[PDB]
Amino acid sequence: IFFKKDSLWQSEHLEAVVDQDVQRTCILHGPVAAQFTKVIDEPIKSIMDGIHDGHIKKLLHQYYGDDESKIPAVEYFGGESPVDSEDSAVFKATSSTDEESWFKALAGSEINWRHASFLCSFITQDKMFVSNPIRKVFKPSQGMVVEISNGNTSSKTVVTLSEPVQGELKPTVILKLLKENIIQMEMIENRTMDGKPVSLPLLYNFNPDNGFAPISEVMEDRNQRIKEMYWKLWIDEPFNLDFDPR
Amino acid sequence: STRPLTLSHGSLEHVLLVPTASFFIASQLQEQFNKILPEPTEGFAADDEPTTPAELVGKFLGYVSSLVEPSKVGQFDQVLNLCLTEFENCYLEGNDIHALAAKLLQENDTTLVKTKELIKNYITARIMAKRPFDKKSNSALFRAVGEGNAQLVAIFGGQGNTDDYFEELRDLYQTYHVLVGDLIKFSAETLSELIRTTLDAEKVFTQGLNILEWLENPSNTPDKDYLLSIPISCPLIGVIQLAHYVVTAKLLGFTPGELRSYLKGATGHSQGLVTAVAIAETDSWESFFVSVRKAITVLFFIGVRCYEAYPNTSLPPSILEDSLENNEGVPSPMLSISNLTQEQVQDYVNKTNSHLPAGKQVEISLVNGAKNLVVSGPPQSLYGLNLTLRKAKAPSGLDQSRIPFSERKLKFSNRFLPVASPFHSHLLVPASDLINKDLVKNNVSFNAKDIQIPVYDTFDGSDLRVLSGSISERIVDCIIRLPVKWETTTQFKATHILDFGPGGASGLGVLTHRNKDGTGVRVIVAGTLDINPDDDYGFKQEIFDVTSNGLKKNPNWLEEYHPKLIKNKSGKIFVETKFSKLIGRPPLLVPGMTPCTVSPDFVAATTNAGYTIELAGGGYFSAAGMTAAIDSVVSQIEKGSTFGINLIYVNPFMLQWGIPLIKELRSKGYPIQFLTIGAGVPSLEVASEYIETLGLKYLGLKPGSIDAISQVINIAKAHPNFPIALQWTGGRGGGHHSFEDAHTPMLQMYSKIRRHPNIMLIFGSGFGSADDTYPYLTGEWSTKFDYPPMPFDGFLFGSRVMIAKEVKTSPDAKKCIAACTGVPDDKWEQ
Ligand SMILES: Cc1cc2nc3c(=O)[nH]c(=O)nc-3n(C[C@H](O)[C@H](O)[C@H](O)COP(=O)(O)O)c2cc1C
Secondary structure, eight states: OOOTOOOSSSSSGGSSOOOOGGGSSOOOOOTTGGOOOOSTTBBBBHHHHHHHHHHHHHHHHHHHHTTTTEEEEEOOOOOOHHHHHHHOEEOOOOSOOOOOHHHHHHSOOOOOOOHHHOSSEEEETTTEEOOHHHHHHTOOTTEEEEEEEEETTTGGGGEEEEEEEEEEEEEEEHHHHHHHHTTEEEEEEOOOSOOOEEEEEEEEEEOOOOOOEEEEOTTTTHHHHHHHHHHHHHHOOOOOSOOOOO | OEEEEEEEEEEEEEEEEEEEGGGGHHHHHHHHHHHSSSSOOGGGGGSSSSHHHHHHHHHHHHHHHHOOOOOOOOOOOHHHHHHHHHHHHHOOOOHHHHHHHHHHHHHHSSSSSHHHHHHHHHHHHHHHTTTTSSSOOOOOOHHHHHTTSSEEEEEEOOTTSSOOHHHHHHHHHHHHHHHHHHHHHHHHHHHHHHHHHHSSSHHTTTTOOOHHHHOOOGOOOHHHHHHSSHHHHHHHHHHHHHHHHHHHHHHOOOOOOHHHHOSSSSEETTTTHHHHHHHHHSSSSSHHHHOOOOOOOHHHHHHHHHHHOOOOOOHHHHHHHHHTTTOOOOOOOOEEEEEEHHHHHHHHHHHHHHSSGGOOEEEEEOOOOSSEEEEEHHHHHHHHHHHHHHSSOOOOOOOOTTTTTTGSSSEEEEOOSSOOSSSTTTTTTTHHHHHHHHHHHTOOOOOOOOOOOOOBBBBTOOSSTTTTHHHHHHHHHHHHHHOHHHHHHHHHSSSSEEOOOOOOOOHHHHHHHTTTTTBOOOOEEOOOOOOOSSSSSSETTHHOOSSTTOOOOOBHHHHHOOOOEEEEETTEEEEEEEEEHHHHHHHHHHETTTTTTEEEEEEEHHHTTSSSEEEEETTOSSHHHHHHHHHHHHHHHHHTEEEEEEESSSSHHHHHHHHHHHHHHHHOOOOOEEEEEOOOOOOOHHHHHHHHOOOOOOEEEEEOOOHHHHHHHHHHHHHHSSOEEEEEOOSSSSSSOOOOOOSHHHTTTTHHHHTSSTEEEEEESSOOTTTTTTTHHHSSGGGGGSSOOOOOOOOOSGGGGBBBBSSSOOOOHHHHHOOOOOOOOOTTTO
8 A cells, every 4th residue: 555555646746756756656658659659848739739630631631632612611510419491480389389399490400699599508607607598588388479580691680589468469589689799688678667668688799619608698797787777677867886885 | 871880809999880781791790700709808918819909800800701702702791891991091001011010019018929810810801802912012112212212132041040940931821821822832732743753852751741731730740850851941941932022022012023123133041042043033923933943943952962962860979968068059060150250260170170081071161251150061070170169268157357358268159050961061062963963854944134133142242144154053053062151242232131031030131230230231031020129120011111110221330420521600620520519629538637637727728729628536635626626727718618527436435525516516507518437337327317417518438348338338328318428448548447459349339339329439549640540530440350430439648648738747757758669559468
């Protein structure tokens, strides 16, 4: 036990070995994989990119006649489980409508901000991975109608959900696009003192370079934007947060 | 104007709206069938009683059809036509009876005997009703063939598939009497004619060859030792195959020429090859029996002449005792060696032939697969070989898992075939010339122009038609003495195969399926109606199925797992595999390594290098010390990056805080994408807990040997929609390594893994470049082993990465790792 216990950490910290002599230490290493460990301090990204490209270059030569153009493009490459087109669409949610089928119908076939925003099971709050609110909101139930405008042109596409507000049926959610990589889930409140509804912008960044979770929630002045909304509902002053609590 | 008429078997009933015109005779046959039908029992377990309303109606149809005479137009006929059409449009939803029968077996608590009793009833009822299958069936399979989306080849099984083979002929007679009972009696009288025709046939047929007598009355049926005797068995298997062909042609509603035209080629195993060429030449229903008489004749002669040259002899009762008392077969003139290569067996038979004289030397008869040979000779000499083979084999209940792969004792099986003649051995050579004098006697010769579809020779694999010499001479030469090179002859490109021969699911169909698993080609056993639980080969129903369940294609690995490329909006090129699709990063990962991937700075760097790495838990002791590590990763990485955690299974103390910690971080939502379990595979309950509680994306497992891989497969099956990275590594891996070879366990499991779409099969161990990994992405790495290509979804690098910039290994260690020369994959086990 004395001889053998704790026998690995020594190689990483040759300063805490008798002579700073590596020949004392135990280094785990694969006999076969020892044929390719020859260049020291080669950067991690240099090796990995160097293997991947070594792959891409071969596949391209063997299966695309060395023509890069032939490669199929996508919005973003990720978040596709290994289990397995009309513009002005409408969808009527019942109590019995399937969850998956409903979300596949919302997303559409083409890989675009919609596809991510309705199928990404997660989103990124800072570094944290919080469950997707857009899959929570468009969980199907009685009343809600989902209209899609410019549905075959992503950039212009705007999904509107509408629900029964006091017997009559009004729009609740307007998920649309701001500037290229900004998704505004404009959540509307109609039941107000003056009848003039209050629009909450739940902004989200859309990064296609993160194939896994391309949807991140905007948190800078996100409190301020919920404050501005609750300053319209509750307060009847002009909005100002620069007042001392004391 | 139709009055209701109800018929019941206890709780279950059916109703037919009988026209008030034909109500009296219907209501008369109603009480008649109700007094024939026995009392309802609990569970309906007993025989001769329906379990379902389809089976009840079927029995009614059968009972009615029995009272119907097809010559005389009776008052039973109009009600028969009314109740038959009622069954059809109530139960046969366009689909064939065989598909319905298959759904009854799959869904209901109906036995297979009940199903065969339903189907014979329906067919009987269909024939007496004066309603043949003149209409060309809408069977999905043949529809796809006609449209050119498929290609068929018909194979024909030979001797030694099964011992109890006569019970197939019985089953065909009993079930499809009304379809094949004309062929059976025609064959019967043809054999009877050939007995007293031939000078010395009556000698060998001691207990006669009145096949119709034994079929009609099972009591009269001789012992199986007489039935396996080749002069009887040969032509009778011939008749079994032809009867399976006719059944096929009739149910489809084609002529024997029309079905032959649908096929792109046909071949047989040994004496099935003769049926193939007889089926190759058939054209109409009328000129069918000219081809049959040819097939019967040739099969009768080869069976008589072979038996006369070398008959089975008295065997010493000591040898029979010794083979029985070691869980080995009764000696016979063929022995099947499974899980040994052709070269090994050739060496051992060369050793045997050394001592033995020329007259008793044994030679390899069939090469069924790469690792499945059959040696033929004298059963005493084949015992003398079986003794040599029993030395080398280790006990089946021996654990060699802890022994290095190449120092293990090679384990195989060796069982005697159920056959009564040394086919494809020098012992049957004298018969050759005698058969040709008998073949020319009956003028039973095949012309090249008469054959329309190609038939493949069993020895060289070439087409029969192209032979400039006598086709009858060559096909005799093939069956009696020339060895079968089965994988030479079966190298045709075809989308489907039809097994007609004997054996059902033990015969030739399943052997070909195993011998070209994963090349896409589907095998359908056309012999018997049954349910395959894995659905890795079809039964009769899939021929006659009219829904999309007919044209089921077997996965082709090369094309289904073809590594692709894709580009992002930014225009970065990813390798597109199963793995990469999920993670949305290149399909490489650096696996959890203690102490190299314990450093938060390394994990962070590699994550920020656009690759997937696992935080090694092995360097961490407390929930706190790990939590502080992770929060040092999270600080460094980019927003919406992720990294995995590599917990060892064998360290219980590590798991008891490690698992709950991850559960807390994931319930709070830290960027922990996945968990790897290194050194061990968890139990089904513990693995289920990790999946359904820790709320990961996927779960990595590192199986050490075959038993582990199996256990992984079980866990994936238990959670079909949850993705499961299988991180396979050999014994050649760095760190804690098993004794397993890198390659062989994947040859032996690639099939069984890929049948579960949620397993993301990652090859690892001995990788540091693209050149050495390319053939395992392409799949070609399996071609060296004589398999179809087997592409892998991803790759892990363990050793290669340890001389990186960001790994905290001390510079003089890095120098020492570099200075290691290393050895190729063949040497490492030193
Ligand atoms: C220093 C070192 C530490 C390792 N530590 C672990 C570990 O903690 N858990 C584990 O499952 N595998 C460990 N491995 C095995 C790797 O995860 C991987 O299976 C193996 O390195 C791949 O083989 P290769 O090293 O020949 O590439 C380690 C390997 C090395 C070289």
